[PDB]
Amino acid sequence: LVGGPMDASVEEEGVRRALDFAVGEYNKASNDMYHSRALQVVRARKQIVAGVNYFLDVELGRTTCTKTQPNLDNCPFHDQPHLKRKAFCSFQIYAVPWQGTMTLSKSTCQDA
Amino acid sequence: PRLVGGPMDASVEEEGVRRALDFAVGEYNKASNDMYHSRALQVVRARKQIVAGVNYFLDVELGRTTCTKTQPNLDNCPFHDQPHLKRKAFCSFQIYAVPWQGTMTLSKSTCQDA
C-alpha cells in the first residue's frame, strides 16, 4: 500500500536514523570548517510507500492458440501426444499497486 | 505494511497473486521459443513479501559546534558559546529509506543560513 505524509514522533528510531544521516550529509557538504549538529527538529513527517514481491512457482502448458491470433477467447491445452509441451518455472514478480506497475524481476524455467 | 519480513505463502485466490500470475505468463509467452501461446497448468506454490520504503521529511534547525570537521574524536561537540563564532542554519531534508536493503539517501534538501 501507500500512505501520504503524516507527523511522526521524534522518538521514532526511524526518525532518529534519518536525522543523523541527514545531519551527516550536511556536515559532509557544509561550507564551514566546523561540524554542525541538530539543535532542534521542528517538524518530522514520514510517508510509507510500498511494494509486493510475488514468487510463484508455476507449471505451464502449450495451448492451441497462436501468438499471431488476437482471439485468445479459449485455448485448450494440446490434443495429440506429440504437440503437447510442458515447462516448470519460478517467476518472481515485483509489483507496486498505486504506481500501477509490475516487473518480472526474475524468471527461471526448465522444459520437460 | 511490513518494512522487512520473510516471504510468506499467499492464497492462490488473492487478486494480487492472480494478477502477478497472469502478468508473468504474459511476459513468459512474450519471450518463449514457440509459435504457441501458453497458460498456467498449475501454480504449485505462491509466496509474497513486502518491500517497504519510508520517505522522511525532517525540519531541522542546525547549530555550529566546537568540534572541527577534520577531527578524530567527535564524542564531545558543544554548541559555540562565543557570539562572533555562533552560526545557525535552517533546513528541510527528505530522506528515502528502504529498511530491508538497509539504506538511506538524501532525496533532497534545502537550507537557509539564519
Swiss-Prot record, chain B:
Main location: secreted
Illness the protein is tied to: Cerebral amyloid angiopathy, CST3-related: An autosomal dominant disorder characterized by cystatin C amyloid accumulation in the walls of arteries, arterioles, and sometimes capillaries and veins of the brain, and in various organs including lymphoid tissue, spleen, salivary glands, and seminal vesicles. Amyloid deposition in the cerebral vessels results in intracranial hemorrhage and premature stroke. Cystatin C levels in the cerebrospinal fluid are abnormally low.
Gene Ontology process terms (BP): defense response; immune response; negative regulation of blood vessel remodeling; negative regulation of collagen catabolic process; negative regulation of elastin catabolic process; negative regulation of extracellular matrix disassembly; negative regulation of peptidase activity; negative regulation of proteolysis
Subcellular location: Secreted
Tissue expression pattern: Expressed in submandibular and sublingual saliva but not in parotid saliva (at protein level). Expressed in various body fluids, such as the cerebrospinal fluid and plasma. Expressed in highest levels in the epididymis, vas deferens, brain, thymus, and ovary and the lowest in the submandibular gland.
Motif (Secondary area of contact): 49-53
Note: Potential cerebrospinal fluid marker for the diagnosis of Creutzfeldt-Jakob disease.
Family the entry assigns: Belongs to the cystatin family.
Keyword Protein transport: no
GO molecular function: amyloid-beta binding; cysteine-type endopeptidase inhibitor activity; endopeptidase inhibitor activity; identical protein binding; peptidase inhibitor activity; protease binding
Disulfide bridge partners, by residue number: 67-77, 91-111
Residues of the full protein shown: 33 to 146 of 146
Residues carrying the site annotation Reactive site: 5
GO CC annotations, alphabetized: cytoplasm; endoplasmic reticulum; endoplasmic reticulum lumen; extracellular exosome; extracellular region; extracellular space; ficolin-1-rich granule lumen; Golgi apparatus
Subunit structure: Homodimer.
Organism annotation: Homo sapiens
Protein's name in the database: Cystatin-C
Phosphoserine sites (modified residues): 11
Keywords assigned by UniProt, alphabetized: Age-related macular degeneration, Amyloid, Amyloidosis, Disease variant, Disulfide bond, Glycoprotein, Phosphoprotein, Protease inhibitor, Secreted, Signal, Thiol protease inhibitor
The protein's role, per its UniProt record: As an inhibitor of cysteine proteinases, this protein is thought to serve an important physiological role as a local regulator of this enzyme activity.
